[PDB]
């Protein structure tokens, strides 16, 4: 058990094929119509985890 959670949390700092792994970084550097794609990539990866 103690391993599984440490695997889940450490999955938060992965990109899954995006510019960065920080939500408040993609929003502060690109306009939203260019940013929903990256946000969707992160959302799908974090759902799969």
């Amino acid at each position: 058990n103690a391993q599984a959670l440490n695997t889940l949390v450490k999955q938060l700092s992965s990109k899954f094929g995006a510019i960065s792994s920080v939500l408040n970084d993609i929003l502060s550097r690109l306009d939203p119509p260019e940013a929903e794609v990256q946000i969707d990539r992160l959302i799908t990866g974090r759902l799969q985890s």
């Binding site: 306009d31 939203p32 119509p33 260019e34």
Partner: protein, 49 residues
């Protein structure tokens, strides 16, 4: 265009991110350019928000 930034977009005319229409353009230099005296066309340049 949706999610586009600039003087016109941030001061004169702002389109939403959920636009479901069409945009049409055609040059009007033949007539609307007037005779070195086209002055009725104006645009805002400064605004608080």
């Amino acid at each position: 265009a949706p999610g586009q930034t600039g003087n016109i977009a941030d001061y004169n005319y702002k389109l939403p991110d959920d636009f479901t229409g069409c945009v049409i353009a055609w040059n009007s230099n033949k007539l609307d350019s007037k005779h070195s005296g086209n002055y009725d066309y104006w645009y805002r340049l400064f605004r608080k928000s």
